[PDB]
Subunit: 237 residues, 6 copies
């Protein structure tokens, strides 16, 4: 019922988990949710709704990049009643002892995109998550015995940057992970009056050049998913 | 293979057609290509390689927005030997005499993205197509009896833009179509030394709810595909 | 000693409360700290150290504006072993449900200053607080039965802004309070590897025109101080 | 008459060739036009009108820099019925394979000027030539046995630039020639609704300070002028 | 009163000298003025009013940085009738032939602040002093046997630069001194229709009393 | 010789007056100078050297706009030993009380050009004149009974600007005259270590004011040139 999602009101839960990869969304639906059904397939951007421990939950890909996820998050918020979005992504690390498969939680997200400047009269908008969602995720990770670090992400427009020196700048200012969406989702959440959080799994070290495979990212980053799902239940109270 | 493409050198032709929707890529392979073989499916971004009138051709989705297509086009160029990219997409018009189903060829692409400023030391980089490819597309269009306009596209970062007034400015400056990728693909081609072209069909008239029927759009879609494919043959001389 | 603080290592606690007004720092030291002693008076920027429920704590003015507070925060971190800074300030509100004397906690801070762009290669640095410090303040306020909202502040360079329309944009994007330092302190904390939090008391409403007096700001905003001090004790565990 | 041109409607053809140097315009009139008459001498900016193979054609200097040529091109468009402007100039190369005496056709023009950002709400306007004019020029060149390169020029505000590093950037993104006017003329054409093209001959290699001799310059200049003139005849059909 | 100044119209003279440090304002008031009276102490930003050779004169700290002094100068101009602001500060020099202990007069002020771009539609506003005040300061200095250098200051937002990349640039383009306020004060003066001047002593690469004498005598020259 | 000046060291005085129009330079030479001889005619940009009251003085056009005058002033300073440049031009007024034929002295020059930001690492360079030259001009004018206004000029890149509202901003900030060169000349002067000044006569009121524009002054164009020349004589003493 929207230009990029062929579904109707009620087809989505009020909370949506969103990886960039629709195939990871499919994996999550098949692995963590009961009674999951596909609710969207437009442009292959798979979305599903099922239950987790009785709680109605949706998962849907948002694609790669700020412009892509801004489209889906906006539509979910304005036309499907979605109140909370939890991005469950991958990222590259720049810090020396942040390692592969570490879970990072983006309370804020830096960016080299122009979208928030366009929204905010060319000033600095601090793209932040909802505090209660951050807190829920931290508490859930603790209950699960999973380490999770909270801090700044950096949302890049260019996965292949011509400016390698910027990575030293990110490292100097404590950036936990380089991904491509958080700052955009946070801008949309503030623009349209909803709540968002980005949780990422470290899938590459930008310095050491260690990296996981495409298959590993699609189907094995499960700590962040358990954290996300349990954090919703805490939020419900 | 690359982190976003599960294939090896040789799997892709040296020319790749790219719609945003990976389902359109599959449709293109099935409809216009002989002996089509799927060569990528990471993140559901379907890619295929086949032949058109004997000529080896590939077709693969690029996803929505500059950051998404920048990843795929970079990787195709540096790791798969691709020499030419032709985006085949949709766009919205802002000019009165540009009608639904019109074909537009982006000789240049304006943008509100920051990617080319990051590349170009914060100055104005004119994101342009390769001239020969533009000319090949014009001649292929003529031989098919299809009228096409050549000029500027505008590649937006925000499909849902909070700056409605900018559309008046685009109209004032002769922008032929509003889409979300061309300026980024043109930046990648310049950065990595390849050739690119974006052709679009007008599928919407901004500030108006006018829409074409399903059969009309497929017919028009097919016309664009034919122009792109025939243009490659002309380029081969 | 440093160019703006005539004290030696050890004279400051490892946690410093910092209002913009040195006379407020004096009030706080005399009212909340036991055995308080003056440790700075350079440029009349009073700083004191004493104990709160057995915990060594310092309080010192940072003056008005990002450039002023950036000086003091840097010096405390590099030369006095300060690990945490809690700014305890005043702000003006734009949101219709925010009232005079409400306490707001700045998980992030937007800004129209150029300093973070200077630090961050002209990109958007999300100026954020330390998460644990935010949670400690939230928990302390709950234990005290004091209400407090958590979200974005906006750190202005011009208290007398010629751009009145920017306040509508701040309001649309949920800015809780307009002040003049948080984004700068958060940038310094990030640069030098320390932790910071800004808590503000609403001293004016930009829409309803209500306003506390200079005398009230100097001495009567005590809820935010109780929250700050108790949050430190929580932080110590 | 207009503030910088003392002529009347009819004194100029609907196509004007424009070198920067008014003395070069005088040379073009004497050399290529029959029955040439001087139609402007305000500020010494000589313009002439005559015929080339029966076709009415004008030639006039535009002076140095974007601000200068923007004045002349605007006035020609709004007050003298001019439809097409062909800048005929020299440029410096930054690419090793681009050689002295090569003819470059600016299908696009990059710039470090702010004039187009001012016009285009501080976004990226792709300053482009008219496609048919570009094609006419290629075809004309081919007929004359010259292979012209088509791509981006860079229009500089500073002939004596303090930023030597920018040339490396220009080279990396494939800029064919450096001059000082094209992006400005293209901006004017778009703003006031006309068509423009810039053709340049490479008279210098910026990195080595290679410089063309006087005799070879006169030869390549003539080639460029023949190309421009014959392109007009092709456009007429 | 204003939110940052607890005084009333008439408490300030129509010219105010402003050092950054309020304790320096107190020193100035005590050393140079007759019948000096404290007229502001909000936030400890001490302001005083007295006479210098029969001429009513005020002196008040403005704090460090563009945002701080922009507040105080605006309120003085719009709410206390002040017509002229003279900043009397210290600066660091980058030029070889600008000496320690030299007096520099900022006819213009560069800055890495965004405040004037906010004011001037993101274009380049040349933050300048009032010409007559510059002339008066030069002439007052001359009469005191001092050659003041007139030129550009640079007003920094970051005393502690993250990379220090601007220093060589300031030197290349002839900046006389580095401080943290002038361009802000000049922007305020332009915005609200008053006149301002920044005078600095080169404190790095009295003297202080000489600078104050130049500022005070330059006012008396202006009154003529 | 230099790329834009066919002359040798010694041909120019160490002070050069520069109008935009080279024909105006000719007029000044013939009207004001003894034993004037032409020293340059490259690109029709006439320059002359003669004496005024025994004092060796040059006069030469600079063309229109920052890029044009930046070329000439740089070449004069670095290759012809020029120490002082005085632009003598016309400007438009935006202030209601500024009269036609009033003389404006640009102690500073605002601009919408990017050249100084290029020089100054994207920060605000205050483009200022030499103080002694300003003072000499004020005294020279006063001696002739002319009260010259001293303040900011605004140097525009676009004579035909799309942003009419900016003239309101100029008026609000007390801009005395609008022209097209001062900020660029002042930038060159600072870059290459020389001294410069722009003096202008008001030739028009920009835009229509509800108010009444005062009246017209009795001051002439010849009066301004006299001021300029006499200011040189004062500076010599
Ligand atoms: N009116 C419009 N505005 C922006 N983008 C598009 C498109 C294209 O469709 C996608 C978004 O729907 C994206 O790839 C964009 O380039 N079609 N019509 C459009
Ligand atoms: N070399 C220098 N750099 C920056 N600021 C200053 C100052 C002034 O001193 C204060 C900072 O110490 C502030 O008001 C600034 O304008 N003196 N010397 C300086």
């Amino acid at each position: 019922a929207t230009p990029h999602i062929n579904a109707e009101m009620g087809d989505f839960a009020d909370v949506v988990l969103m990886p960039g990869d629709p195939l990871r969304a499919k994996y999550i639906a098949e692995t963590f949710l009961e009674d999951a059904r596909e609710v969207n397939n437009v442009r292959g951007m798979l979305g599903f709704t099922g239950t987790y421990k009785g709680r109605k939950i949706s998962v849907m890909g948002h694609g790669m990049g700020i412009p892509s996820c801004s489209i889906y998050t906006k539509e979910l918020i304005t036309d499907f009643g979605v109140k909370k979005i939890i991005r469950v992504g991958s990222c590259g690390a720049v810090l020396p002892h942040v390692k592969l498969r570490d879970v990072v939680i983006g309370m804020g997200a830096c960016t080299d995109s122009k979208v928030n400047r366009i929204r905010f009269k060319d000033h600095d908008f601090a793209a932040i998550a909802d505090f209660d969602m951050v807190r829920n995720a931290v508490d859930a990770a603790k209950a699960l015995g999973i380490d999770a670090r909270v801090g700044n992400l950096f949302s890049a427009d260019l996965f292949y940057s011509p400016d390698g020196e910027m990575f030293d700048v990110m490292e100097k200012y404590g950036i936990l992970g380089v991904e491509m969406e958080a700052a955009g989702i946070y801008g949309v959440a503030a623009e349209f009056g909803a709540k968002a959080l980005t949780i990422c799994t470290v899938s590459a070290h930008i310095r050491t050049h260690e990296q996981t495979t495409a298959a590993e990212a699609q189907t094995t980053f499960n700590d962040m998913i358990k954290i996300a799902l349990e954090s919703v239940l805490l939020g419900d109270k």
